[PDB]
Symmetry: D2
Subunit: 260 residues, 4 copies
């Protein structure tokens, strides 16, 4: 547990990030959440963190595709929390197309959010962590940080970048009480994946649940989705003392994707 700890999760209004936020609050951390969505939904999430788990929670809206906005977000988060012990760099987007058709503006958007925001958020968080001699940076990469699939040039590039950046962060901070690791999930049935399921379903002329099975069968040997709650549990483990010497590495929760 994490009582007393101060955590920030990017892209935590929904999906994996919301589950990360929830598991951290359940472990006793105060939490800054972030991301887009309907204002009434975001506020109900923020207030639920506080009323279920007895922590402080803050929502800071920032579009993390802008470098300065990300750096300012971290400073505001730290001010809200009174410190910053755990940063989860989670916000991300996807777009599928073959390379020769891949929109330039989608390349730029995915690099900006999925890769550069991790750099700017880390850069802003590190001096706070270095001053207190304790920190956790948890980057949400992907199985696509280690291997590739067709039609995902920007995302694969970005996620491979995140894995590299994680290593660098870990080595620069080696021995300082700060670790940096990349969680690399396989398929998790959030809206980011439901769109891909829907696309397969129209391509193949099949019901959505058949399409979900086809999506799994191609990549994920277990034939089951990874859950956001599992991922939250992994982030809680990374934040624990057992993981004090776990740094610069990848934690794959991928149902076997990368074993073959």
């Amino acid at each position: 547990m994490l009582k007393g700890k101060k955590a920030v999760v990017t892209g935590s209004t929904s999906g994996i990030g919301l589950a990360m936020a929830t598991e951290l609050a359940k472990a006793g951390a105060d939490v800054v959440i972030n991301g887009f969505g309907q204002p009434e939904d975001i506020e109900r999430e923020r207030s639920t963190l506080e009323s279920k788990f007895g922590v402080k929670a803050y929502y800071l809206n920032a579009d993390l595709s802008d470098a300065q906005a990300t750096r300012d977000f971290i400073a505001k988060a730290a001010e809200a929390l009174g410190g910053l012990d755990i940063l989860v760099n989670n916000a991300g987007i996807q777009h599928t197309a073959p390379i020769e058709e891949f929109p330039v503006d989608k390349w730029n958007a995915i690099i900006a959010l999925n890769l550069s925001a991790v750099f700017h958020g880390t850069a802003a968080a590190l001096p706070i962590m270095q001053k207190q001699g304790w920190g956790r940076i948890i980057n949400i990469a992907s199985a696509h940080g280690l291997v590739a699939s067709v039609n995902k040039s920007a995302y694969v590039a970005a996620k491979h970048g995140v894995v590299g950046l994680t290593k660098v962060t870990a080595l620069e901070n080696a021995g300082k009480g700060i670790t940096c690791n990349a969680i690399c999930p396989g398929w998790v049935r959030t809206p980011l994946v439901e769109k891909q399921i829907e696309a397969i379903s129209q391509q193949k002329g099949i019901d959505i649940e058949a399409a979900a099975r086809e999506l799994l069968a191609e990549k994920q040997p277990s034939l089951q989705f990874v859950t956001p709650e599992q991922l939250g549990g992994a982030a809680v483990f990374l934040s624990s003392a057992a993981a004090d010497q776990m740094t610069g590495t990848t934690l794959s929760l991928d149902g076997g994707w990368t074993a073959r």
Copy 2:
């Protein structure tokens, strides 16, 4: 936690394996321990598992360099425990020499224990796990399962083998409720490493603690040893529900060794 669970740890009379056993018993598992040592020491360890943690504990002596003895060990362990939910394949040895000088009998001994015993123990455990639709196989590999160092041909080969075998085990059992993963530690200050520290100390004409620092500085960016307790905590995480879709992968606790 693991209340009700039945665990076997090979090479658990001392070192990392003893800490694994201890963390599993603390989480509520009954435990079979194994390995060499003074009989009075081994019995005090066995009885301490029971009296501190309120579990059942058994010591089964088996030299796991013999295939049949390993397979018979698993059967006896399962009979003692009334089942087998978690197998930790930990027992291992080391010998350093350059390849052209590496004793053939040391090659054979390290392959037999560090690689083949993992295969024979898994083979014996799997049908039990397959019948109950739940299992954890946790192989203790090394950073030397992913990268190399000089003078460790047999050990590096073996540990790379263990990582491959882990993948295979995971894929054959994908979706059955059984996962298989390899913990890959960096330096942990057990007697296996203290011998290497002593060897450096004589080579360099320096005190043991200087030698320990030199051993770390060459490989492990954090400049701190991984602890057996950290490793036990990782094994407990691998046994948890959060790790239900973690299979076929490596969990590096290595102070940054593999990041560079």
Copy 3:
């Protein structure tokens, strides 16, 4: 050999790229070269390709940190050559600083050139290669595409990105007669590295050649630099028929860096 082939090498006015260009021309390819430098030097290089090797050579100035300029460069290159069989994405820059001090504009410049230019150049080249059913895309990544070092966040990220992008390119084009691979060199004594050598020399108060030895000793077990000519030979091999089923992979020429 490559008689008849049409090759483009980015960042080929000096360094590794010039050697790539030279080895390709020696194998009989016509070559488009690119990059910055003194106009008289660039023209002597262009004319030397033609007069020593009896090929056609063209210099096209393009700043490949601009997406549209890269895409237009490829189109102009193809028009000059009358086709495009081999693309070597080589141009790159470096900047060293720890993350919290790393200039934002240097992050952006290194991502733009070292990662995004590979994407835009590939995207423009692919349809030409797809129409003729033969192509080679050769991306110059680095040992820093697979592992990290301190103070190189942007470059490591970018080069890891290039390795991911290489995979994607290879899978999208699998079986079409087009391969895509990443050459991953260790240290090569170009001006990009001589600046780092000079920096070590001032930090340590030592002569340049001592500093060059220290730079090698830390990373590169062979204690010798990789040469640009070796790299050119690797690119020629990748362009050969023996490499028709070599695709989506990395070719490390790194003196052992990534083995440990």
Copy 4:
């Protein structure tokens, strides 16, 4: 080219090894071949190396699953050739079964040949290479040296072991003029694979060529087999000066297998 060079290829009476031998002889090396088969066939192969390529060729029968026989084989090979510049450790076997059914004697046979023979052959060859300050050790691993498939526990373990051993060999010999690398092929249509094709064909009730397509489609994105001649060309490249700083690494010729 390799005029003057002295090469040994294990398991070169047929398959990949025969093609390796042939490409080396074509490049001008004298060659020792090895392996099982009909005596009239083996002698026609030996004499053909000499009469087509104008080199000396020798057949030495040794069962390389025996350590001493392997070490004695190398000594006899060196005596026949008058030296030993290039060793290709190629001989291997396969057996498919799930782990719990995998015969113990097949585990032992595959570890002995596919892993331990590489160690014993390297150990015997190294002192010869160290004395002349030049050598090439080329280990034939597999895509199964980097990733896994079901029902191939022993082979995957062994091939992962070979990749580890390759690294160690390279680091111990770093800077001595000796390199060690692992070629990692995907599917190559030799008798080792034709048996697996036949097995699929009976499982699925389909013609052999359909079965060959299914075998490729599952693993190898290019949908085409790697050829033995391609592999021979890779071994010739590894033996060249361009590869003087290529050491401790893997060269994947796998049609994209490991990119996804």
